[PDB]
Design a protein around this nucleic acid. Structure first.
Ligand code: ZN
Ligand code: ZN
Lengths: 94, 82, 148, 108, 99, 85, 99, 83, 109, 93
DNA sequence: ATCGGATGTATATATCTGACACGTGCCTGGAGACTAGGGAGTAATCCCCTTGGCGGTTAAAACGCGGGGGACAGCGCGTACGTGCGTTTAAGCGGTGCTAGAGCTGTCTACGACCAATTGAGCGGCCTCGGCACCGGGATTCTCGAT
DNA sequence: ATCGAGAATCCCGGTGCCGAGGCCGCTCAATTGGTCGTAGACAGCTCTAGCACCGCTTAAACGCACGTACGCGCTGTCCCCCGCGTTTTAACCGCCAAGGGGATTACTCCCTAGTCTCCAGGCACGTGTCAGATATATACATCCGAT
């Protein structure tokens, strides 16, 4: 058979069944969502790498990712995403 | 071998694109200029696509090569993987 | 403030209509800390078993869930030795609309029917899933010496 | 939070934290990766995904359909001030264009 | 005597029709032949996946639609409604791909 | 018909409802509860757990969170509460 | 009796003069004060290295020069020699800085 | 030590000099306010990123390298001050 | 080659090979770095630097000066064709602009 | 103190190869250093992405060659590839 | 078509001032030798997907014609911007003083990489029924010529 | 200002089909537990340069008057796109046939990371001098009004 290929389809569907419990999604739309998730992941994780390289560090912490989110996203998306990530980290640690 | 296939981008096929772009009236010399700029854009994209194919030691131009070339030129495309 | 008023309303509701086979109240002077006694449900192998547990109210209530912890040592796949419990309503899906009565009744239902999909302790959950006679025996023999 | 459970549920997320941690570690991004970075990154990704999906569902409901198609994604993205800025140099396949006719061209 | 629509009232109808749809407007076989002819210069005896041609067509159509969108604004700025080859050149120079 | 006092309340405060907001799921709750849950809670609906993040970002910008139609109805019947609240 | 140039010659002379030298054209203290005011709007009690202010001035002047070149081309496209705010708006729209 | 209405320090002669370098022969009378607005927007956009970069490093002085990095991120690379 | 001289001298270059190798290894690019990558990269960098320096020196000599200053580099880069496209989105400090006036603006005859 | 590395002396050596008479100021050296660093970063990043695409874990000379071909325009790319191949062939023997 | 003012720019000369080029000490990074292991090269196999072909039908392209509206040229008005001049403002240069904070060094603790077992999350393949596309008939709404 | 007729578009009901979604089996990667070396967090110290102030010159900014030439509106002409009918061309679709190359697996060898030792190349620092910027005095190119 074909080799295993990973994707975000299951998690995207899980998220979709929260905002709109009675709505489906096409295959091309799921592919577009997967591409968008991959692109944003690459953008943020590539900005954080240079942000850590500037200060002569070896670790990528939540601080670098937070500042990358601040630099990338627009004025209000950045605020909301920073709040969401801070809440997630706080809930994870404690 | 193929020759003079740029004439396949006919006048109606350009008028439809102009109408989608919101153009109400078109002059008669627009079509040749549009064909020229389209050929330039196609050459620019396909050069990098073929370079990506050749580096990977392959004989087929996959959609991944086109996606990578478009992203390299700053024309990120969503829908064909990547 | 708002949380103190909410706790006052909770006690008013509890006093007006006492809940089902549970009783909670402030053990000390501070209203933040509570103690609750739960009796063994009839449709369960925990007949005649009283369980004491402690309630800690976060300063930002009800927007943060309270923390429950069993004082006694009870055998169950969803409870550790330290007295914590494994309930999604408690922490995963808590909402400000829920009250302490709702989570207490959910704990009682969990006693009636455990959670094998995401058990907190894998070994005793496997024991539950494998056989019932040994699980029932050990549960009865520990609740006859630790619950009361 | 208490340990001995899946990492995605400790943070209350839906996107995987283990997969994000592995991709961050093996992505040639940095020599070391902190233990809290995958949580924050997964939270941001999930928030953005829900942000787009809610608007896409609203657009689909406006057209009496119960299934999201790329046209609805394009409509949702191009009608938002911030999402359009974020995905400004991005082309959605089979997404069309927004209806916009200049006021000069309209009949008088 | 037979019905005839005044000039300009059918172009607007096509504008309203084509902005509502999403399908590709260029025919597929001529575009495939054009892509293969253009690519035969860089490397000979190449093969194309079926998805690569469609990706190229989508990108080219989007680029041309954007270029025409800019050309319309250039034409309107000059106090006329007809787009001329001197608007495409100005748009391409300002965007940065002509210089 | 005109709602009674008992059937116009927020589930969080449990007291009289002031400045109602109506979520896309039609669940109603007083504005201070929403403002507080945005800061610390999961930004969902407190009652049925439906995400309203885009709704919040849309309406806070225009300051149209309050349900004006029901706010006047509740305010006219019970104005003596506002002095103590 | 007094001699004075016709309107237009001094403009061309200044154009030739300022396209030959490379010094900065905005006074340094006012630009420094404006930059400090904006930064204080962002984060209070900030300090500035001199090289930071210098780099900001260079970037701003280069950007303005490019924008004015595009504006001049836009104005010429409309059969004019005067640059008006609509030319700046069209250049910014086509370049993609305002959409 | 607050500062107010300092954008008036970008005088009309300075804008005329910039236009002359750009190659402009005749200038309308409403160009100056539009140019001031464009310059203010650009300065705000660059300074925001510079301040973010200097905040991530727990400093209080904005170095030239922060401005260079912000300009490079925005797509306008600058040669002469490092990098 | 003889495997005895320095790496830059062995390859016939002036840019260092050890420094390029170290920057490639410590730059978080790949888990491994080949033996011939630094040589190729140093050769390409040296070629580009030599081209730009040659053009800048030509401009400086035409200006009747014996020192390259940023104006000369700006002239050399903009007057070329491939180099202008390679550095299209790059601002040179103290570089000025190329001199040109639109034909419409010139006085009538 | 602090030691800060730069490409100043190599740029000067190349200049003396090309123009034995002309000198160079300090701002020009800063500009040349910035240019060299920028080109290094561009080529290295493109090569790393190319190595990642083909599921490799190393950067050989062919990755750098393809990155140079992708970045530099036509004649510049051809001459750069020629010089790089010449240097590699001279170094390997 | 110059005729001569009249202005500004280009050219040659003296000088003197700080930046450029080079010499010196040294110390930190690069070179040399060696070992081990895994990553990449090579060969063979499978089968999937790309290329090529044929016939039909019919949607879309091509060609032509009448004419109405839009592009372009020409005139005229007046007002807004250029040029030159005198007045007023604050930039620019120099020098002094002070301390906030960037840069560096030394300890040491807590966070992250590595390794082994192990099992449940998630991927691949199947199957089914409902959402959406399509077809046919009718109602609604722009559109245009004529009063 | 209007009424009516040809025409394009939207609504609604019935039929069919294919792909979205859920289920089952299973392999592998993520989790748990323990160990260890080292990154960076914190504290103390130095000394650099960023901020603030003061006095003098004169350079650039500012306000103003005159005038002219360029923008904007209006009118006219003519020719070139647009809308519609008819005919020709080939795109699209369904079907069949073949084999080229993509994808995978087993084996092996040689190329690169990691470690230690040693020494010399490049960096920080200091100093001599000439390239070029500035002031001064001619000489030519260019603009402007008008014979
Ligand atoms: Zn309330
Ligand atoms: Zn709800």
């Amino acid at each position: 058979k074909r080799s295993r290929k990973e994707s975000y389809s299951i998690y995207v569907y899980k998220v979709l069944k929260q905002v709109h419990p009675d709505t489906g999604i096409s295959s091309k739309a799921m592919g577009i969502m997967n591409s968008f998730v991959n692109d944003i992941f690459e953008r943020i994780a590539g900005e954080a790498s240079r942000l850590a390289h500037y200060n002569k560090r070896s670790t990528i912490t939540s601080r670098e990712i937070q500042t990358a989110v601040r630099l990338l996203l627009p004025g209000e998306l950045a605020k909301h995403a920073v709040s969401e990530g801070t809440k997630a980290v706080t809930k994870y640690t404690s | 071998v193929l020759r003079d296939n740029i004439q396949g981008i006919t006048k109606p096929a350009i008028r439809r694109l102009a109408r989608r772009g919101g153009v109400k009236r078109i002059s008669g010399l627009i079509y040749e200029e549009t064909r020229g700029v389209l050929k330039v854009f196609l050459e620019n994209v396909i050069r990098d696509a073929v370079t990506y194919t050749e580096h990977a030691k392959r004989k087929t131009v996959t959609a991944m090569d086109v996606v990578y070339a478009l992203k390299r030129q700053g024309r990120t495309l969503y829908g064909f993987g990547g | 403030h708002m949380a103190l008023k909410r706790i006052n309303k909770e006690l008013s509701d509890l006093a007006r209509d006492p809940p089902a086979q549970i009783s909670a109240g402030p053990v000390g002077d501070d209203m933040f800390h509570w103690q609750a006694t739960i009796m063994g449900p009839n449709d369960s192998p925990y007949q005649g078993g009283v369980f004491f547990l402690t309630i800690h109210f976060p300063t930002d209530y009800p927007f943060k869930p309270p923390k429950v912890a069993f004082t006694t040592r009870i055998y169950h796949p969803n409870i550790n030795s330290n007295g914590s419990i494994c309930l999604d309503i408690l922490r995963s899906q808590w909402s400000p609309a829920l009250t302490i009565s709702k989570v207490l009744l959910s704990i009682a239902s969990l006693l009636d029917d455990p959670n094998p999909d995401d058990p907190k302790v894998p070994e005793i959950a496997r024991i539950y899933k494998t056989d019932r006679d040994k699980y029932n025996r050990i549960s009865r023999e520990w609740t006859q010496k630790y619950a009361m | 939070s208490a340990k001995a459970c899946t990492r995605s549920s400790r943070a209350g997320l839906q996107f995987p934290v283990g997969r994000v941690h592995r991709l961050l570690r093996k992505g040639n991004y940095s020599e070391r990766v902190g233990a809290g970075a995958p949580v924050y990154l997964a939270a941001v990704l999930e928030y953005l995904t829900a942000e787009i999906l809610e608007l896409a569902g609203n657009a689909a409901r406006d057209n009496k359909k119960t299934r999201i198609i790329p046209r609805h994604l394009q409509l949702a993205i191009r009608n938002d001030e911030e999402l359009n800025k974020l995905l400004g140099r991005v082309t959605i396949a089979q997404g069309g264009v927004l209806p916009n006719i200049q006021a000069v061209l309209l009949p008088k | 005597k037979p019905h005839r629509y005044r000039p300009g009232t059918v172009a607007l109808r096509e504008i309203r029709r084509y902005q509502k749809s999403t399908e590709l407007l260029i025919r597929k076989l001529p575009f495939q032949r054009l892509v293969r002819e253009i690519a035969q210069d860089f490397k000979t005896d190449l093969r194309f996946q079926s998805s690569a041609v469609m990706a190229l067509q989508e990108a080219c159509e989007a680029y041309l639609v954007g270029l025409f969108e800019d050309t319309n604004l250039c034409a309107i700025h000059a106090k006329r409604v007809t787009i001329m080859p001197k608007d495409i050149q100005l748009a391409r120079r300002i965007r940065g791909e002509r210089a | 018909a005109i709602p009674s006092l008992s059937e116009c309340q927020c589930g969080i405060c449990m007291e009289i409802l002031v400045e109602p907001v109506t979520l896309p799921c039609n669940h109603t709750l007083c504005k201070p509860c929403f403002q507080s849950t945005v800061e610390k809670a999961s930004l969902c609906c407190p009652f049925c757990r439906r995400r309203v993040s885009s709704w919040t970002r849309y309406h806070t910008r225009r300051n149209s969170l309050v349900n004006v139609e029901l706010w006047t109805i509740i305010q006219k019947h019970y104005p003596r509460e506002c002095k103590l609240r």
